[PDB]
Amino acid sequence: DEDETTALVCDNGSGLVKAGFAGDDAPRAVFPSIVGRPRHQGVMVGMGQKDSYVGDEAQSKRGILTLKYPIEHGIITNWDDMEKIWHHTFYNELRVAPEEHPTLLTEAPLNPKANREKMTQIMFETFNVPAMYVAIQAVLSLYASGRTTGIVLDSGDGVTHNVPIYEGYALPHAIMRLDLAGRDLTDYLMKILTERGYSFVTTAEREIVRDIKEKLCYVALDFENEMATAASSSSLEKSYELPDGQVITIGNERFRCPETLFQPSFIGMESAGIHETTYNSIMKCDIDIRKDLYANNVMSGGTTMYPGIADRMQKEITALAPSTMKIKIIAPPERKYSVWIGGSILASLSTFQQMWITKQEYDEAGPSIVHRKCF
Amino acid sequence: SQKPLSDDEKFLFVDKNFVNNPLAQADWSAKKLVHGFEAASIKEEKGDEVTVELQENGKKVTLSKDDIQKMNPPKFSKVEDMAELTCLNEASVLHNLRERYFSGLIYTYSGLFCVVINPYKQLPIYSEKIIDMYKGKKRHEMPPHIYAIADTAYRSMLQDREDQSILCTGESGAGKTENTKKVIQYLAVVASGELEKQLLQANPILEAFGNAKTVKNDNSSRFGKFIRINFDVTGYIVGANIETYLLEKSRAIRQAKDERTFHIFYYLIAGASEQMRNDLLLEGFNNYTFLSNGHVPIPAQQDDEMFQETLEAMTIMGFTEEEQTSILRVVSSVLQLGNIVFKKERNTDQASMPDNTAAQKVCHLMGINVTDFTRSILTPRIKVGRDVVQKAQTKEQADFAIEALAKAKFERLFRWILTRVNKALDKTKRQGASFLGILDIAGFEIFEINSFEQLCINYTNEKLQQLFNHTMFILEQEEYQREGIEWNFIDFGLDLQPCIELIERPTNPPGVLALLDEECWFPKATDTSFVEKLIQEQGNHAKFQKSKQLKDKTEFCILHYAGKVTYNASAWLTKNMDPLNDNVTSLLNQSSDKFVADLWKDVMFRTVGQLYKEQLTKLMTTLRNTNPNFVRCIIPNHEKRAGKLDAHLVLEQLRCNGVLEGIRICRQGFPNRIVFQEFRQRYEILAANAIPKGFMDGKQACILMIKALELDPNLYRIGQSKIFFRTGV
């Protein structure tokens, strides 16, 4: 405070943005990296007195707003609206001075330099911050799980990654960047909801489908036999009541989308599944290393919050793993904010002072200071 | 205050050596005259192996320089203030202390210290006459005594308009309550109540809830406290208010070999009647997890009586019979919390409770819902804002949450009682313009190996001794300012500063305790890894002593103020915890037992070290806003043999009291400071020449004599009324 640092934590993303600070136990506020703009604008019968809405605001006024995605993968599409997101984060929710408390930004593994330039520039020019550290999304989850080594898989809606941690660190080839996340399962869900008889044309309706997924998506262990079993359109079929006036009923399709994650052939692609691309990244390590990696196979993210995923993933990992090695998936009690938690931890530790980049360093070396500190 | 024939001055006035002779040849042996020490003459130096003739016994014996110091002239036998020695060697300090105590001279000055050595018997030397003998007297005019100190303090409040405090510390039992009373009684007479009778009864109550038994002391307060005596703006006692800091809460849940937890736990189990035990769900000593260890009893003592005694005191204090019982319901339930153990689930357990009868016992006494209790402990909920996040914890953490609760409950209970003491003590109507903060706290605690509890204690102590070093420096410089002395030297508190940072230092390379904090945050941290962190970080800690190649697998040392201390750290991550769940706090607010509801009528984790840092800061700051007066407590003999003094025990305590180190500060200044006219008188026989024991030019005449003496300018300095001289000069 004032004279002392005390860092801040901001875990953004196209899915959810977690606002908090160093040493915090739970995010103060959570909202998607989404910014809405009225179709009419100016004077409206039903508006929130703004021509620009951020996060919860955008999602509360879906019916009147066009939903833009400043973050798309974790790629910045609109760095001006990124300032709006961080304004909402730091000024509205946290209500703290950025010209005072150092900050911590999260980063998806294998992030284009262009994104690092956009993030760094803004923080040291628009929100002028004494020091700011960029931390690797997945790696933060590892720390949140209470581990310093092992497979580090983080799989949500935005993008699925894997960063195995061992004596050394994963290089740009053992790090997985999988284009098969909940986004794809959301759009697939929409398609197979039309098979039932539903229609989700607009972007707001696209988000509704994702909201439906959240509370129904079930991970089956035996698709065929459970598909037949879940035909019970009465006892096992379950609908999603959208708080607005829309109820979408889903049957055995609840565990049809997860199958596309494991087997893209359920969509109609020959792409390798999440456990096969994970295996591929595991094989980039030595025999001795991958044994320890299997022993502590840390998993988190949206796709790990669905019932059944614990047993299904374990089976799949043991299918593609030596039987002579110790194989155990680590499932923290909090796998939704596991990345944010890692940020809170490392920020509270004194090691943050040896990781952050100061405004002075930025001002001297410019945007290049990012890689000068670490790649 | 100067007449041995009277019993009120018999153990007061320094009847000593009055040879009165300035010639060094006349009042000191011609030979190199040398934990008591034998009279000896240095015969031959073979390095540290110096052969001396032990004149005491006539024995020519080779002796290390470690035990060889210049013995001061016989004329300093038992001086009032140890600072009056020509050369400040502790060999002669110890002898003066031995002689003085033996002679009845319990009060001794040592620089700024008012040393009190326990006589183990009542000495008349504190009468109202004696009060008047110190009333308005300038310290040195009269023999050493707390009354003189109290006088100083009083008039500093009155005449100088400065808030005072009494930093009384050392060994518990050595005039602990006596010394406090001496201060109060001095001013009871001068600055002039009934409500302190209750405070006198509060003492043993708070000992039941605050004192514990250890190896070197069987009645040691596990907390620091001070008494704020409130004064009327015109200098009169109008009231008092007490406060405690740094309660060793871990003491309520653990005890080491040869130790006892807070006494009340034993008082209650042993002294409760069968009716009480039934009503309080009391079981025997082997029926609790807490109090586990064979060292339950104390030879020749009886908890039954002390139990009853406490209740009698509590009655006097105004505790309603039901309050008294309710208090004991809490005490009992703390022990029953000890008996709560979690499920052995192989995740970090949300935990499990196949049989939570122990918890039911706790919730019976509390009057709370055991299933809400259990559930919230299994998965603690943390209110964020509008949202609340059920933060599931492991079964180990759940076990710690129980102990956290146990500790917290004990403290709350303690604070309640403490508050009630102030309700009785602190009269409403009163001026309280100024005050005298009498600090009552233990000195350094050193065993063959120390733990966390002791680390925090010694950490505390160094913070408080810093107050002394800092203050002392200022006072020394004050005289330099009064005089024309330019030796600014260095603020001696800086000797403790890195020793303090060694513990306190957070961000930046962490100290020891800060690393413990770090280690108590990572889920799979161990005590071995803690030690490894010490090994990594100690390269930046000048005051940290890395231990030997084999020893550094666990133990390590710290270069403390009171001497290097070895610390264990085999289980510190189980100590620096306290997962206090405020869902339980709320449930306790919601208790059917309204005593409990009152305890928590209103409403995380952090660390124990950090909590002490906070409480310490509060104490230190309060003390630093006042003017430190210094009193020290010494046990000359653990057998309580009135008149016997063992310099072994004493020197240890002198070091743990900061007296021995205070001497070092004095050795770094100018102890022997001689008045210009005095100097002429002192050194006339010592080579007067042109300048006898009186001469017209006050300053130059002394200087001319100094030139005749051929003294080194770096060992002295010409002032305004004195010439400052270094020890040995």
Ligand SMILES: Nc1ncnc2c1ncn2[C@@H]1O[C@H](COP(=O)(O)OP(=O)(O)O)[C@@H](O)[C@H]1O
């Ligand atoms: N109750 C829930 N059950 C299952 N999944 C949930 C639940 N609540 C949230 N989720 C999902 O968890 C994921 C949040 O993970 P996060 O790492 O913050 O997302 P992203 O990185 O995709 O922005 C989202 O996919 C969200 O839909």
Ligand SMILES: [Mg+2]
């Ligand atoms: Mg995650």
